[PDB]
Ligand binder design. Sequence first.
Ligand SMILES: Nc1ncnc2c1ncn2[C@@H]1O[C@@H]2COP(=O)(O)O[C@H]2[C@H]1O
Ligand SMILES: Nc1ncnc2c1ncn2[C@@H]1O[C@@H]2COP(=O)(O)O[C@H]2[C@H]1O
Ligand SMILES: [Mg+2]
Ligand SMILES: [Zn+2]
Lengths: 19, 96, 251, 49, 197, 197, 298, 180, 13, 249, 79, 87, 50
Amino acid sequence: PAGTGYAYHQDRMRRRAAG
Amino acid sequence: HLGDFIEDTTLELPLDSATTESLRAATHDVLAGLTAREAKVLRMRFGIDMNTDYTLEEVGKQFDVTRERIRQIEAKALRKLRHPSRSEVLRSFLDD
Amino acid sequence: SVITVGPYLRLHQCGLPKKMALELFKPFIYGKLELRGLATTIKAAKKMVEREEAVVWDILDEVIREHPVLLNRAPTLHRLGIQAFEPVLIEGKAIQLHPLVCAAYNADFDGDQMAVHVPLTLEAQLEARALMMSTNNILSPANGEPIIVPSQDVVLGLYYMTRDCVNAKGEGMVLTGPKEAERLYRSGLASLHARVKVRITEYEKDANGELVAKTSLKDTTVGRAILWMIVPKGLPYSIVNQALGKKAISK
Amino acid sequence: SAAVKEFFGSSQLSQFMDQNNPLSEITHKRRISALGPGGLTRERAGFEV
Amino acid sequence: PTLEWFLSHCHIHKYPSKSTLIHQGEKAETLYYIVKGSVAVLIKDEEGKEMILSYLNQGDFIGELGLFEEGQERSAWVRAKTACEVAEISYKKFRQLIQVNPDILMRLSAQMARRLQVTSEKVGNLAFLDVTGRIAQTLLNLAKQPDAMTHPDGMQIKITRQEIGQIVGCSRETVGRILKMLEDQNLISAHGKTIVV
Amino acid sequence: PTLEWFLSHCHIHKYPSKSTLIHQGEKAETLYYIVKGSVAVLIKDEEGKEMILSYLNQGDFIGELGLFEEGQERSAWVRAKTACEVAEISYKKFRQLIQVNPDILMRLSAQMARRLQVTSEKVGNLAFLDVTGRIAQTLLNLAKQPDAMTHPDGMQIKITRQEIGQIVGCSRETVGRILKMLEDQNLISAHGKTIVV
Amino acid sequence: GVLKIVKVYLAVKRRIQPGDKMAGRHGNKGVISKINPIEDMPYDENGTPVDIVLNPLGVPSRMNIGQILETHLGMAAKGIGDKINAMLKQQQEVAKLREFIQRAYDLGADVRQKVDLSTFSDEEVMRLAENLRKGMPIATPVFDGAKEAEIKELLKLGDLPTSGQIRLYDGRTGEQFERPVTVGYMYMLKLNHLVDDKMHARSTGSYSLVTQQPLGGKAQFGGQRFGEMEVWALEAYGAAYTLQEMLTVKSDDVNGRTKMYKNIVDGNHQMEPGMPESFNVLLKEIRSLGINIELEDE
Amino acid sequence: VTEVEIDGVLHEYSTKEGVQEDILEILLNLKGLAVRVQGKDEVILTLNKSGIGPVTAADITHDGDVEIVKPQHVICHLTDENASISMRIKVQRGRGYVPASTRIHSEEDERPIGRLLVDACYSPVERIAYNVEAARVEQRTDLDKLVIEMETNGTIDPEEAIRRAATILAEQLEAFVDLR
Amino acid sequence: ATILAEQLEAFVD
Amino acid sequence: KPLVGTGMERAVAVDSGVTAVAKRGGVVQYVDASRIVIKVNEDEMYPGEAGIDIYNLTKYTRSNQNTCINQMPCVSLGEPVERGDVLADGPSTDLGELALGQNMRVAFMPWNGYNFEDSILVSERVVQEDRFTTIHIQELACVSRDTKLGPEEITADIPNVGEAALSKLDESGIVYIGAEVTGGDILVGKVTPKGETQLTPEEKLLRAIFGEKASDVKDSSLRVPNGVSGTVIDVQVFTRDGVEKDKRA
Amino acid sequence: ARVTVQDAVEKIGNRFDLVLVAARRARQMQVGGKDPLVPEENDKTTVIALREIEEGLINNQILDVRERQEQQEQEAAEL
Amino acid sequence: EEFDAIKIALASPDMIRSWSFGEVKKPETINYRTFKPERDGLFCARIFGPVKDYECLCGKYKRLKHRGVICEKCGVEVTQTKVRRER
Amino acid sequence: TEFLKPRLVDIEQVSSTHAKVTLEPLERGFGHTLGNALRRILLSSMPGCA
Ligand SMILES: Nc1ncnc2c1ncn2[C@@H]1O[C@@H]2COP(=O)(O)O[C@H]2[C@H]1O
Ligand SMILES: Nc1ncnc2c1ncn2[C@@H]1O[C@@H]2COP(=O)(O)O[C@H]2[C@H]1O
Ligand SMILES: [Mg+2]
Ligand SMILES: [Zn+2]
C-alpha cells in the first residue's frame, strides 16, 4: 500500500470510498 | 530438520505441461485436415473433447449400423496420414 | 558464485558466467525458437540446446541485452547490500564486478560470495533500471557523503602524480596545454610531479547556468596539468592545486 | 554391544577424520574440548573460559 | 558358435509383436541380427496397401543393406510378428569385426544368394503362372519349410485364406471359391486350418 | 589389375552375339566375370514363352549363385547380346582366391544389395501398378542410363522398341498403344526414339 | 530385499581457474581474477619474467612481516642452486663445489649445527648436489631464527643487491618503471574452497511437499533463500511488483508459476497472482487448535 | 606429441609390473622432450624394450625424416628384467599450448580405450631478452644495437624464426598501409 | 606503416 | 618442498604412519610400482625369521573428502638402508618431509587494478606446467532389490535406448574400464517389475498410428549427474551367499 | 538514456510513475505488438519505453486518451 | 479469492458441526502388505478425500458408471483428491 | 599456419584533427604491441617545417 502499489492501493481506497 | 530434504513426487511439471499442450494443439491442428464424414467419428470414437467413451452400436444408430467398414476407414486414415504427410510432427513425440 | 573483480568494467556492467544465465534464461529462448521454428517443438529445443549450437549463444547474447539483473551479498544489512546491474558475459566461472562498491557491501576478495535474482516481470525490470541502477544511489540517505570514495591504490597513485618534488628534472619551462606534457611524459622526458608553468582554459557557469570561458597561466605540477584534461568544464584550477587527500577526492 | 554401537556412531566425538592433510589429521587427534555430557553449551557458556 | 562370438559383442534388446522395428527413410547406421523370433518386411503404396516382401526367421541378419555406403536411408518397414531378441551393433562395430573374423560373410552371402534365387522365382511366377500354379509353387516350397506338425497322414498348416493372399496376391473369398473348386478337385482339405493332401 | 594377371593364365574368352553361354540345368563349376560387352539373363516356360530376368554390363560377375553349394545347376539362361569379353574361373580356384583376398567382396556386396533394391521394386510394381506406371517408371529411368543423349529440355533414347519389351518383359504393341496415350498425355515426344522431357 | 548391489569409482582431475582461493602461511589469503600471458609479464634485464604479482598496500596494518624476510631468502637460496647448476652444466669439478659448499654451511654467526664434507664420498656429493641445484633449503626456528645480517651476508654471496630490489621492465611496453621492486620466493598453498564445489544456479525443479516451495542445496538443485532483510531493502525502495513476484510465483503459487512459464514461452512477460499456500495451511492449523479464524470477504 | 597408446593399459591411473614410474611421471618425462621434423605435420613412432635398465630416447624406433634433440632425455626405468614395454607416439606440429583438451572438448569422436590422450605445448621458446646498446656510426652515435639473447628448445633455426616473425609482422602491416 | 615497411625490407629477404 | 623451514617437519612426515619405514635396515630386494621387497640385515633379521619384509602399497584410493591417494618409492634398488628410513613418500610429502605447496616467484606491486583488495594475478606458464593441478574421486552405487511385484533386474536389456550410452555397456549392462563419460551417461542397467496404466484419447490415437507395444517393466538405471565428467577406473559388486553370482560377478 | 534514468523524473516528477507507466506501455508493446515512435536501435523494450517517456510522447494521461478513443470507436463500430 | 479483511473468533461447537463430514473411529492405518488406508481412522480416504482416480478401497465402484456411489463393502466414495487439504 | 587478420572497422572522425578509429579482429597479444609502436613513431617521427 505504498511506493509502487501506492497508486493501485489508493485506487482501491477511493474504490471503497466509491463502494 | 530432516523434514526439508524430502521430495514432493506426485504433482506436475510446467515443462511437461507445455509438452502435452503443444502436442494436443498439433493433434487437433492435424485432425483439421481430415475427412468430415470421419472427423466426427474420430472425435467420438475415442472420447476426444468430451467426458465420454463412445465406441460402438450407439454410433451404429446415430450415424450408420455399419461397424467394420469403420475399421477399413482406420486403414484409410493411416494411409491418408502416415505416408509422409504429417508424420514428421508426430515423430518429435516418438521420443516421449 | 565466488566473486572476482572486473577492473576494466563500467558502472552498469557485471561479469556473468554465461552458463549461469543459460540455465536461468531457458524459457525465453524456447519461446524464441518456437518463434523462429528451428526447434519447432520443445524436445527438439532440448536436444539442440544439448548440442551447443553457436546460435544458442548468438541468441543468448541477443536476449541478455538490456535484461537487467540483481546482485546479492549477505549480510544484506542496509539497503545497499544488494544492487542491480546490467549483464556482460565472460569466459569463466567467476563473476566480475565494478570494484568500488565493496564499500556498501563491506566486501573483499578473500572468499566472499554473492547470489542473484531475476527481474522477470517488466515492472521489476523497470523498477530495477530506475531505482537500483547504480546511478540512482551514490549518496547515503543517512548522511550526505558519496559512498564511491576511491579506496586505496587509486588514491595513492593520484597522490603520487599530483605531487611536487623539487628533485627530478624539467623545472621552469612553459607549455600551451597538457597535451604536449603528455608528449613529453609518454615520450618520457619530463618529471610529472614537478611544478612548471603552462596555460589552461577553464570554465565557470557564472552567468545564468552559462559557462564563462577564459584562459591563463599556472605554475603547476605536470601531473596536475595533465589531470586537468578530464575536467568537465565548470571548475577552477585552484581546486586541483594540491596533492589531494582522500578527503580531497571526496569534496 | 548396542550401547558400544551407540557411543560409536552417535556421540559428539565419534567423528570422521580429516585426511586431506597429515597436519590436519594429526592435529585433529590433538584437539580437546569441554563439550557434551558433563560439558557445556555455546548459548549458555560465556567469555572468561 | 560363430554366432556366440558375435553375440558376446552385442547388447540384446527385446521387442514385442507389432513393433515396427525399422522404418523406411531414416539414415542407416545400425545393423540387427535375429537371436529370437521372426519378423515381417513391409512396404507401402502411396495411397494404398502395403505388400509383405519376405519373412525372416531366426539365424538371419537385418540392416546389412545400408551397411556398405554412407548417407543411406532405410528401405522398408520392419514389423514384429512376436516377441523378438535382436542382437544389434553399429556398422563401425561390424567394420571392426569383419576386420577381425570371416565365416558369417559366407553365411550372409548364402542367405543373400538364396533370397535372390527365390525372389527371381517369384518374379517369374507373377508373369507366367496362373494363380493356381502360383499357389502350387507356394504350397510345395512351404511344405519344404519346417513349421508344421507333419500330420502323420497328410500335411497341414493353420492358414486362414488371408496371407496366402498376400504371398500369392489376391482377394479373400475368391480364394474361398477356388479353394472350394479345388476341394472339388480333392487336392486339399481345410476348416480354418488347411490339410495339404 | 588382377585382370591382366588372370589374363596371362588366359581363361578370358571372347563370345559373339547370341552364342549361348548359360543353359539352365547345366553343371555349376565355373564362375565368369565380365571385361566388356552386354548380356541378357532370361527364363522360359516348359511351353516356350520366355522371360528376361535382367541384363548385365561390364565389370560384373556371372553365375555366382553356384559357388556356395557344391554341385548346383545353373539357374537361368544368359544369352549374349553383343560381342563379349568374358573371364572364366573355377569354383575351386575361386574359393582359393577367397582365402587369398576377400576385399573383392567389399565391392561385390554393394551391387548385390542394389540388385535386391531393384528386385523388390520389380515384384512391388508388378503388384501395385498397372502398365501405366510400369512403362512410366521404365522410361523415366531409361532417361538416366548412359548411352542417353541429351534433348535440350528432356532426354533422348534410341533403343527403339525391341529391347524395351525385354527390359520390362512385355509386348511392344501394348507399349505402342500407351506410348501414344502418353503422347496424348503430353508426357513423351517420340518418333521411334523418344524425348523424355 | 537387497539381493545384490554394484558400486563404482571414478577419477576426475581439476585445473586452475579464477575464483580458486590461494594462500601461504601468514594470513596471506587471496582470490584470483586472471591468468596472464607470459609476454605481458613485467620482467628483468635478463628477460626472466615473474610468476606472481602482489599489491603492497595492506601489510603495515596486518603486518605479517616474516613473509618479507622469507621473500629475501627466497630469492637468495635458489641463486646458489643456480651457481651450482651452471657449475654442473659447465660440469666443473668436485673440489670447487666442495669448497663452495662447506664454506656455505659454515657461514652464520654461532650456529648450533656443525658438519663436514670429506667424511662423505663422491656420489653422495653428486646426488645431494643434484638435489640442491633448484635451491638449498633452510630451517628458520621460529624464535631463534637467523638474523638480517645473515640475510645480507647471504644475498651478498648470491651477488645480488643486499637490498634485494631491482630495475624491471614492462611486459606491455618494455620500458623501465619508476623505481625498483622487491623480488623472491615464498611457498604457497591452494585450498578446498574452490568455486567448482561452491557455486550454483537454479532455474526450476523440485519443490517441497507440505509447502510446495523450492528446495536448497546444489546437490538437490537448490534455490537460494533470501533473508527478510533483503525484503526490507525494497521496502526502502518500494518494488511492489518484484515483491509480489518473489513472494508468490517463484515460491508458492502453483497456478502462478505455471502461468508464467507458458506465458514466457509464448513470449508473454505478464503477471498473475494467487495466494500463498502457507496462508491457508496456517488457517487450517489454527482451526485445528480450535478457533474460528475467518476472512471478511469484500 | 599429441597422443600415445601402449600395450597393457586402459587408462592413465593404472599401473604395471616391473616398473618404477607410474603412467603419469613417464608421460611428463616425455612432454619435456624435443624433436625436429622436416616435411610433415604429424608422425607416428614406436618404442619396444625389455630387460633391466633406464629407459631413454636412444632405444626409439626412429623414422628417417626426424631430428631427435637428445639421446638422454630419460623416460622410465625397468625394475624387472622380465618386464617389457611397447607403445606408439603421435607427434604433430602446431603452435601454442592448445593443449589437446580443446580437441577432445571439440571432439567426441568415440575412440578405443588405451589411446592415452596427451596435452600439448607446441611452443619452442624458453627465454628471451633484448638489449639496447649504442650501434656506432662515425657520426650517428645515437644509433642503437638491439642485442637479443636466446633460449628455446632445439627444433628451431634462429634466423629462420626471426625472418618468420618479420614476415608476419609485415603481413599484418599490409592492413596498416594497404588497408589504411 | 609504410616507413616501417621500408625499414623491414632488409630481412623479408 | 619449501626452502625456508623450521626443522620439525621430518617428525610430522613420520608420525602419521602414512608412509613406509625401514622397520629394519637391509638391502632393497625387489621393486614394483605397487609393492617393494627388502632383504633385512643379518642381525636385524631374527634367527627364526627370514628377515624379508615387503610392503604392498596403497594406490589410487578414496580420501574421506574425496581426493586422490597413492604411494611411491622415493628410493632405488641394490642400496643399503639404515632402519627407520622412509621408503615411499606420500601424497603431500617428499623424502620423508612435507610438501603442502610449491615455492616460486613473486613481486609486490599493483597492476592496473588486478590486485586491488588482497586479490591476485598470475601468469600462464604455470598452467603449461600444470603444477597446481590435482585429482578427486567420485563414486556411485545401485541396489538389486526385491519388490512386492518381483525382483529388480540388472541386465543390459533396456527400452527407449539411445544406443549411444548402451554402446559402452556389456552383456550384463556394465561399463568397460578406461571409459570416459559426462553427465547423463548410462553406466548400469537396472529395471523393476512394473504395473500398467492408461491414457487420454489424444495419446491413444498417437500410439494407435504408431502402435509400439507391450512392456510391463520400468527403468531403474543409474546415470551420471548433469554437470560432471570423469574417468572410469574400478568397481565392485556385493551379492548374497545364497543369491547366485551373476556372470560377471 | 541507458545507464541513466535521470531525465525521466524531471519530466514527470517520480521514479514510481515512470516505472509503472513504462511497464504498462512496453507490456502493450511486448505482447500487444504496437509500433514504436522513436527509432528502435536493437535493444529490448525497456530502452524504448524510457526514451519514449523522455521526449514527451507517452504518459499515463496520453495512454488513457489513446485507449479511450480506440475503445470508444470500437464500441461504435460494433453497432 | 479476493477478500477485504480478516476476523478472529472462537470455534463454536456448531461451527465444527458446520465444518464437518464425519466423526472418526478406530485408529489403524493400513495392511502391512497393502500399504493402503484403513477407514474412519487417520488416513481414511472416505471423509478427507480419495487417493486415486475414482476407486473404492476394494475396487467395486469405478468408471463413472458408479459416479456418485459409495462402496457398501467399505463405505468408500468417488471424487477427485484435492479436498483433502480444504476439508 | 592459420593466422588471423584485422579488417579496418570504421574511421570515427569528429574533426580534421581530432579523430578516432576502430579496428578488429586480432589474435591476442598484439593490440598493445601495435598501439605502443605506433604511438612511438607517430608522435616521434613526422617531417614538417617549424
Ligand atoms: N526380397 C526380400 N527377401 C528377403 N528379405 C528382404 C527382401 N526385401 C527386403 N528384405 C529385408 O527387409 C529389410 C528392410 O530394411 P533394410 O533396408 O534394412 O533391409 C531389408 C532386408 O533385410
Ligand atoms: N535378379 C537378378 N539380377 C541380376 N542378376 C541375376 C538375377 N537373377 C539371376 N542373375 C544372374 O544370372 C545367373 C544365372 O545363373 P546363376 O544362378 O548361377 O547366377 C545368376 C546370376 O549371376
Ligand atoms: Mg570477505
Ligand atoms: Zn470399495
